[PDB]
Design a protein around this ligand. Structure first.
Ligand SMILES: O=c1ccn([C@@H]2O[C@H](COP(=O)(O)OP(=O)(O)O)[C@@H](O)[C@H]2O)c(=O)[nH]1
Ligand SMILES: O=c1ccn([C@@H]2O[C@H](COP(=O)(O)OP(=O)(O)O)[C@@H](O)[C@H]2O)c(=O)[nH]1
Ligand SMILES: OC[C@@H](O)[C@@H]1O[C@@H](O)[C@H](O)[C@H]1O
Ligand SMILES: OC[C@@H](O)[C@@H]1O[C@@H](O)[C@H](O)[C@H]1O
Ligand SMILES: [Mn+2]
Ligand SMILES: [Mn+2]
Lengths: 459, 459
């Protein structure tokens, strides 16, 4: 009749209230890591069963006609397998932060760099802290990094990584070929994929890879630099030049280190900036739904714990079942039409799932055509003026478009239970607590997210 | 072959890092609701297996003696059944707060009052808000209340509940015979049990039931009143007297409403204050482990979202499987002894589980006796001066007692998966992330927490 019943994990914040609930099963099928999909893949089979009024727990309310939950279908989708972490060994990341900030952002740092072969050195302020004890605290939890005390300030310690990079490579990590400046809130959706894409650049030539800010006035203010929030990559030959002229470039005031880095490369590096539009600085505040639901290639995120608030750790939970590259992938399904037999015009309805972010139900009215939304255009949902984001984020759609209704279910909870990942999307409607659960039926032993790469730093 | 393996629900904050892990099973056998238990019930069989080093996810690390997780036993523990919610109908609770604060505290309010027969009226500030919409917003989620607009200020709205109570009882709730003043952070561990205990009072006589602050200086400052945060109970005959002298008592400044209520009863009520020590105002800051792990009869809690921080919603999650009365119940187990065959002295260890709060491993040194801790004496763990709390909280013990080591695993996560509740206790040790999981195997259909009282407010 049905298709073992998996019980949803429910915190009391979700178990206690009454809720309108529906669930769908998605079965990830892993293909090549180099496989490519559409920005919005279609599912031509019914997906979301009708909602069921539930009471405390999962008890079916007596308001429902059917006394039971609907039988949800299993939707097979193709996902690109995770890339190998072998190419990550050539990377050495550098941070200017504190051990307290590393501990607060530990889960996000574990997803980005944990269970990879990349090295991390951190310039921390001067203190009485036991660096060996703090280093063991993070390494035993899965984050192998090197803590180095520095007398410089945070702004100077950022550029001070140039000297820290060179000495660490010369003395401890000679196999390093790529060096990377990062913020502690620079979140990599798939670091091994980035390491694989760095192979296209000659390792023996100088290279300066980064991204511009999405806000045009930030580029006007600070110049065409690699904004440090999105991540910066500097090849070893360019680092050798930066070390040669470190004393001539390093100021000791409050100039942003990423701007100082770009100006030093512009002056003595003879290396142009290589632009990676997949790295996102996120120089924007408010609702970031448009960028996350854009279907664009997103390899790094930023500002998610300051300028705006977004649990990127909760968002990447699905990677344990469907791989890293499945995060923020878009599927469209459940297209329904409600025609008026007198006028012939119809109100159309369809769903778009941004994996790990949102479930959006779109309603086109009688006067709204089918192509009213180009989902390859980025919806402008943030606060700043949209004119400064047209150049970087392409042609922007309006947040409030006439004739279009956008009901959004934001991801509230996510849990890994065995081989499955339970996604708990929630919309707080006036008529109740609306819940949409997506259970990803991942393969045995895990679908990725570094679950098999625990001994990859050994020996 | 272990004694159907239940996979633990893991958020990415717990799935990503490496961790030292252990789990024990607890099967609550439900007995009579009036059954009493010791403040520290013994478990005489081994409970906690040896710790297993786990990598990312639940992968058994090669840094382990055995390649598999141990088979943990199932501990049978007697728990008292939840009381009936019939006696809650006589209660009418009054709040002086806003719809925004009700929304932020909705889960805790749902556990306290949801799925009971008690009424709730709230005096909210004047605004253009659609009161009927907000009422439907909370009622559809499980919290039925009446929102009344009031021009009075906050302190006046609290005592203004005297008029709001009398009018609501006379016109909408005539069956109300107990009226209760509460804060929005007044948390009830078992409201039906409190409603049952209120039957011990003659319902036709004036009654003023409350609790004094634990800090003696707060009583010296504001008097021997029923402190509002712990919850105040006023019988209907006393409310009639309070309404007769409302104008003579109600001021218009910033006098605390609970002190104003007590002073009005003192001047016109002719009713002494009946002290309930089980209601705790929680007039303390810092680590509140001593009160929560005291084994004392705790029926109301307060200040858990302001003066101190404690997710009382996560704490009561186990009540879905072991009943409301199991929360904060204590069990001691795993008494181990490590003697020295030369001197004969021994180092002894044992565990004390405060259900839903903490797992503490005590270590007594060679010169510490077995009676070194009276677990009926409240450990002084909060910030303020201990002398001000000796009267209310009995003889206190020191947080740092010589020869006694206290390693505490605090409750980090809690989930209800079908008939089971998973408790995720966490201690952040210098050598790694330490996790002890307790899986409560509740009975079929849920162990309580109002899972069967969903249709109890029907007409
Ligand atoms: O790797 C980092 C990133 C930031 N910060 C500190 O955090 C502040 C805010 O940085 P955030 O990343 O939130 O915003 P940004 O400066 O990137 O716009 C900075 O001014 C620094 O003082 C730090 O110590 N280390
Ligand atoms: O039922 C309540 C309780 C508190 N507050 C607000 O919260 C403040 C204090 O919060 P809390 O109740 O945690 O502290 P307490 O007053 O109990 O010491 C009050 O001054 C009010 O502004 C409120 O609006 N409604
Ligand atoms: O080079 C500075 C650059 O990092 C800018 O500084 C701040 O304006 C904001 O962090 C970012 O846009
Ligand atoms: O009646 C006043 C009483 O509520 C006291 O006021 C504050 O000191 C704190 O809320 C509590 O101790
Ligand atoms: Mn940053
Ligand atoms: Mn309060």
């Amino acid at each position: 009749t049905c298709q073992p019943y998996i019980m949803p994990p429910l915190p009391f914040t979700e178990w206690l209230p009454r809720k309108n609930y529906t669930r769908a099963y998605f079965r990830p099928r892993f293909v090549s890591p180099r496989a490519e999909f559409s920005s919005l893949e279609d599912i031509n089979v019914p997906v979301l069963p009708p909602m069921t009024v539930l009471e405390r727990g999962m008890v079916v309310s007596p308001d429902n006609k059917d006394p039971s939950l609907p039988c949800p279908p299993i939707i097979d989708v193709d996902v690109a397998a995770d890339d190998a972490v072998d190419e990550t060994e050539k990377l050495l990341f550098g941070l200017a932060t504190t051990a307290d900030r590393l501990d607060r952002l530990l889960p996000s740092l574990l997803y980005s760099y944990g269970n990879t072969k990349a090295g991390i050195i951190v310039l921390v302020p001067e203190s009485d802290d036991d660096l060996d004890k703090q280093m063991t605290y993070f390494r035993n939890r899965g984050l192998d990094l090197t803590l180095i005390k520095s007398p410089l300030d945070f702004t100077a310690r950022y550029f001070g990584l140039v000297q820290a990079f060179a000495e660490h490579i010369r003395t401890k990590r000679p196999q390093t070929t790529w060096v990377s400046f990062i913020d502690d809130d620079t979140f990599w959706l798939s670091l091994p994929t980035v390491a694989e894409e760095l192979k296209l650049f000659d390792v023996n030539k100088k290279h300066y890879i980064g991204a511009l800010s999405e806000a045009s006035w930030q580029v006007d203010t600070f110049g065409h630099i690699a904004f440090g929030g999105a991540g910066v990559f500097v090849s070893k030959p360019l680092l050798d030049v930066l070390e040669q002229y470190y004393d001539e470039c390093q100021s000791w005031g409050e100039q942003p280190g990423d701007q100082k880095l770009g100006q030093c490369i512009q002056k003595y590096g003879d290396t142009p900036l290589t632009l990676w539009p997949s790295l996102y600085q996120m120089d924007m505040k408010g609702e970031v739904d448009g960028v996350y639901e854009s279907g664009r290639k997103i390899e790094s995120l930023h500002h998610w714990n300051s300028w705006y608030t977004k649990d990127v750790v909760k968002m990447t939970t699905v990677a344990a079942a469907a791989g890293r590259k499945s995060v923020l992938r878009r599927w469209v399904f459940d297209q329904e039409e409600y025609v008026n037999n007198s006028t012939g015009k119809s109100v159309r309805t369809f769903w778009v799932m941004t994996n790990g972010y949102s479930l959006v139900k779109y309603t086109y009215d009688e006067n709204t055509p089918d192509d009213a939304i180009n989902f390859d255009h980025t919806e402008k949902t943030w606060e700043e003026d949209p004119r400064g984001y047209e150049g970087r984020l392409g042609p922007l759609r309006l947040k409030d478009q006439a004739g279009v209704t956008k009901d959004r279910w934001l991801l509230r909870e996510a849990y890994v239970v065995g081989d499955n990942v339970h996604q708990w999307y929630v919309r707080e409607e006036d008529e109740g607590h609306s819940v949409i659960e997506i259970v990803w039926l991942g393969p045995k032993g895990g679908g990725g997210a570094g679950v098999h790469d625990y001994a990859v730093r050994k020996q």
